[PDB]
Structure 1
C-alpha cells in the first residue's frame, strides 16, 4: 500500500534510479578496469535521491516512477526518492548552483507552476510512495546568511515558495523532509534555537501538513553520523556529528510547536573520517572523502527514520575554472579537488576518490 503511518521508510525499499546508473555505467566504468570496474558497478545499485533541479527533469521523474510501477507489479515493493530544488534565486549564499528562475523575472509564479507540475505527477502515481527532500540550503541560508544581499532579498520569496511546496505536495502517498543543513552549519549552539523557530514556523504556517514528516540533514555534505572523536576542524563545536545535531534540534522543534518531527541523514560522502577539510565551512568537491553508511531504515536511533544518499557521489559541487560561469572561490581552495566541472555534471576523478575511500568498502 502506498499510504503510510509513522516512518515512511518502513515497509518499502528505496529505488535506485536509472539516471545515476547510466552515469556510472557510461561515464565511469569504461574508464576503469579490473577490481575497480566491478566495484563501480555495485555503486550504481545503491539507492540515491533524484534531483529535480530543472523543470526539464520532471519528465524524468515520471520516467523513474514508470520504472517503479513496473517493478512493483513484477513482485517488488519500491519507493520513489526525489529532491525539490528549483527555488527562484536558488543558492543565495554562493555562486556555484544558481538556478533557472529569478525573483526579478517572475520566478515565484514560475516556481508555483513547477510545483503544480510535480503535484500532477504525484497524483498520476498515487500508487507509489514518494519520499521528498524540500529545497536544500534554502532555510539554512535564511538563518545564518542574511548578510548576503541575494539571501536577504530572497527571504519573502523563499518562505512563500516553500509554503506552496509543502501544501501542494501534501498528499497521502508523499513524505516530505525540509532541508535543515548539518552539524557544522546549524548544529552550533548559537544557531540551534533560531533554526528550530524557522522550521517550526514553516510547519505551523502551512497548517501542520501531515505529509511533512520532518527534517533532512547533511544533504550534499560530509559530516559523520556517529563518530566518537571530534575532527580537528570541528574545534569549538560540541555538536560535531549528525546524531548530536538531530537530538539537539529535535526537542527544540517541539518547544516551538512542531512535535513528532523525525530525521533523515545523508551519508553518501561521509565514509572517510576525518575528511580532507582544512576548514569546516569548505563544501565544494572536498578531498579525502568516500562513500559511507548505506541507506537503511534500521538506524538504531529514536529520531532517525533512515540513512540516505541524497547527493549522488560523482556529480560535481561546482566548477574550479575561474574563466567559467557560476565560478565560486570555494571550489578553488586547497581542499577542493581540481580540475572540477560544472555543478551537477559528472566529475570522474571525484567518483574514483569516493570509491577508493569507501567505507563500507565496495572493493
Structure 2
C-alpha cells in the first residue's frame, strides 16, 4: 500500500518561512500560506556524521509527536552540484558513507520519508567515469542502509522529464537498487507541470518493475519558464503548485510533495542573487501571489 497515506505531512514549526510569517508586520497572507504547508527538511555536510543522528532522531521524533510524517532530503553527495551554485557535499565517499550510517542510526525504526540526493544520478555525467561509478555506489549504499528502517519510505532522486531520458534514468535507478526502496522522486527544485511528470514517472515505473514515485509540486503551478539556460535558477513568473497530498493523478504516484522550500534561492544565478538555500521572503511572496494568493 502507499506508505505516505494515513497521516498528514509534518509542518516544520521553525522553518525560515515560519520565522518570516511570524515576524511580518503586518501579517502577510502569502508568507503565512507557505509557512503552514509541509515541506521537506534538507540535510547536508553542515550536519556532520558525529551528530546528524541526533538531529534526525529529534526531527522524526517531533513529527511523531505531531502525529505526522516527516520528509527529509539528503543532499550531501561528494562533488554536489558539480561545483556550481549549490556546491558542497562531503569531501570523500568514506565521509559520505559514515554520514549515511549516522542518519540511519538516528532513524531507528521511526516513520520517515527520505528523498535521496536530488540531482545526483541525473547530473552524474559531469564526473569522470570512475567518479561516476563511485557516485552510483554511494547512492546504492544510501538505499541499502536507509531501508533497514522498515518505516522509512525511500525515494531516490531521478531528475525530471527534460533531463535524462526515462530509459537512461531507469538504468541508473536499477543500478543503485531502486527495487529495495519505495521508488524515486521527480521535479525536485524544478517547475515542470505535474501532468508532464506523471507521464515521465509512469514510464520510469514501467522500466523499474513498478516502482512508485513522488513529484515536487512546490513551484510548478504555472509550469516552467521559457526554454533558456538557467531557466531553473530563480525564474520569475512561477507559481506555487498543488499542496502536498496523496490524492494524485498517476497510478504509481504516491504523493505530490513540496521538496524544495518555496522562498529559498536557487543560487546566485549569474545575477548576484542570494546564495543557494537562503530564504528570501520576496521569492515566497511572489510564488504565492502568482498562485493567486
Q: For 2:143, what is the secondary structure of its paired residue?
A: helix
Query: CA separation in 2, counterparts of 1:200 and 1:27?
Result: 41
- For the pair 1:183 / 2:161, whether they are aligned, the reply is yes
- For the pair 1:79 / 2:79, whether they are aligned, the reply is no
Query: CA separation in 1, counterparts of 2:272 and 2:229?
Result: 21
- For the pair 1:163 / 2:158, whether they are aligned, the reply is no
Q: Deviations over 1:90-110 (max 9, x none)?
A: 112x511111422xxxx1111
Query: CA separation in 2, counterparts of 1:151 and 1:314?
Result: 34
After superposition, residues 219-258 of structure 1 pair within 5 angstroms as 219-226=188-195, 241-253=196-208
Q: Tell me which residue corresponds to 2:170.
A: 196
Query: CA separation in 1, counterparts of 2:273 and 2:101?
Result: 34
Q: Which of the residues 201, 222, 225 maps onto 1:272?
A: 222
Answer yes or no: is the 8 Å Cα contact 1:18–1:64 preserved in 2: no
Q: For 1:66, what is the secondary structure of its paired residue?
A: helix
Q: For 2:17, what is the secondary structure of its paired residue?
A: helix
Cα deviation, residue 11, structure 1: 1.7
After superposition, residues 116-195 of structure 1 pair within 5 angstroms as 116-123=101-108, 126=109, 128-142=110-124, 146=125, 148=126, 150=127, 152=129, 154-170=131-147, 171-186=149-164, 191-195=165-169
Answer yes or no: is the 8 Å Cα contact 2:60–2:112 preserved in 1: no
Answer yes or no: is the 8 Å Cα contact 1:89–1:154 preserved in 2: no
Q: For 1:79, what is the secondary structure of its paired residue?
A: coil
Q: For 1:19, what is the secondary structure of its paired residue?
A: coil
Query: CA separation in 2, counterparts of 1:28 and 1:13?
Result: 21
Change (3 A) 1:184 1:33: farther
- For the pair 1:115 / 2:100, whether they are aligned, the reply is yes
Cα deviation, residue 339, structure 1: 4.8
- For the pair 1:260 / 2:210, whether they are aligned, the reply is yes
Q: Tell me which residue corresponds to 1:294.
A: 243
Q: For 1:263, what is the secondary structure of its paired residue?
A: strand
Q: For 2:14, what is the secondary structure of its paired residue?
A: helix
Q: Deviations over 1:156-195 (max 9, x none)?
A: 2211211211111112111111111111112xxxx22222
Q: Tell me which residue corresponds to 2:90.
A: 101
Cα deviation, residue 28, structure 1: 5.3
Consecutive unaligned residues of structure 1, counting only runs of 5 or more, are 1-5, 72-76, 227-240, 254-258, 320-330, 333-337
Cα deviation, residue 154, structure 1: 2.5
Consecutive unaligned residues of structure 2, counting only runs of 5 or more, are none
Query: CA separation in 2, counterparts of 1:265 and 1:302?
Result: 13
Q: Deviations over 1:25-56 (max 9, x none)?
A: 4335545636xx13321321111111112352
Q: Tell me which residue corresponds to 1:54.
A: 45
Query: CA separation in 2, counterparts of 1:192 and 1:65?
Result: 33
The count of residues paired between Structure 1 and Structure 2 equals: 288
Query: CA separation in 1, counterparts of 2:88 and 2:251?
Result: 36
Q: For 2:69, what is the secondary structure of its paired residue?
A: strand
Q: Which of the residues 250, 255, 270 maps onto 1:306?
A: 255
Q: Deviations over 1:75-124 (max 9, x none)?
A: xx3111101110111112x511111422xxxx11111111111011111x
TM-score (norm 2): 0.90
Query: CA separation in 1, counterparts of 2:267 and 2:278?
Result: 9
Query: CA separation in 2, counterparts of 1:281 and 1:200?
Result: 29
Cα deviation, residue 301, structure 1: 2.2
After superposition, residues 211-226 of structure 1 pair within 5 angstroms as 212-226=181-195
TM-score (norm 1): 0.74
Answer yes or no: is the 8 Å Cα contact 1:80–1:131 preserved in 2: yes
- For the pair 1:91 / 2:81, whether they are aligned, the reply is yes
